[PDB]
Amino acid sequence: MKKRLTESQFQEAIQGLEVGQQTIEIARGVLVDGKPQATFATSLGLTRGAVSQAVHRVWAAFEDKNLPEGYARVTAVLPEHQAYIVRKWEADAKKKQ
Amino acid sequence: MKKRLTESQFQEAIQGLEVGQQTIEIARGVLVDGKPQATFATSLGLTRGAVSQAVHRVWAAFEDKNLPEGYARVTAVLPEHQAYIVRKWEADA
DNA sequence: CCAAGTTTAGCTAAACTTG
DNA sequence: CCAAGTTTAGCTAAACTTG
């Protein structure tokens, strides 16, 4: 019920995004129009898991585009201490609330 | 190519991994016994994609465990400069 | 408790990649 | 070409989480 976009936010999310029209329609109805995921499961004959994933794809896409300014995602295999530091960097940024 | 394992690496690989006996059989058949994926596609009535995925789940598992002692894969969203630092570190291998 | 939503190994399609 | 293998959005099952 919580977790939502504007049309403008939504349009950003789906720009470039490689997904079909069903996914788009489901995500808009849920994220923009505040309708329950369950009415799309029912109406489309789909499990609730499928609908949660559809909504998730558009959600995730929006987040990947709204990372704090200047910030980058990074992944790497690191030795223990260097890995610990990344954990601490993040965790100290989470305990910045 | 062509990626392969002993039955002992294979076991190390899948330890702690949630994986069914079918994925196990396909992965063993291909990575240990050296058989081709197409074999299992027919014998089990699966698509090539499914077999290709089965082999992948185990291979990725092995990869994560043949990593050097203490080494860990990590992911984060950081300020560029800290990301720069992580890339610099990660290059050092 | 309840009902809605989440998660993840594992499947398909079908376009793509490799040798 | 073709044979075999890769990729990834989309789906399920059904345990688990959330409100």
Residue numbers in the entry:
A (entry chain A): 1 to 97
B (entry chain B): 1 to 93
What does the paper behind this entry write?
Gene expression in the IncP-1 plasmids is stringently controlled by a network of four global repressors, KorA, KorB, TrbA and KorC interacting cooperatively. KorA is a 101-amino acid, homodimeric, protein with an N-terminal DNA-binding domain (DBD), containing a helix-turn-helix motif, and a C-terminal dimerization region, joined by a linker of four amino acids. In this study, we have determined the structures of the free KorA repressor and two complexes each bound to a 20-bp palindromic DNA duplex containing its consensus operator sequence. The structure of KorA consists of two domains, joined by a highly flexible, four amino acid linker, which retains its mobility even when bound to DNA.
KorA was crystallized in the presence of the operator OA. Structures from two of these were determined. Both show the DBDs of the protein symmetrically placed about the DNA axis. In contrast, the orientation of the CTD differs in the two crystal structures. In contrast to most proteins containing a helix-turn-helix motif, that bind to one face of the DNA; the two DBDs of KorA straddle the DNA, with helix 4 of the two subunits binding to opposite faces of the major groove. In each operator half site, five of the six consensus base pairs form direct hydrogen bonds to a protein side chain. In addition R48, at the beginning of helix 4, binds to Guanine 5 O6, but an alternative conformation of its sidechain is also seen in one half site, binding to phosphate 4. G49 is positioned so that its Cα atom is in van der Waal's contact with Thymine 7-O4. This restricts both the amino acid identity and the base, as other bases, including Cytosine, would cause a steric clash. The hydroxyl group of T47 forms a water-mediated contact with Adenine 13 in both chains. The remaining protein–DNA contacts are to the phosphate groups, including many from residues 18–23, outside the helix-turn-helix motif.
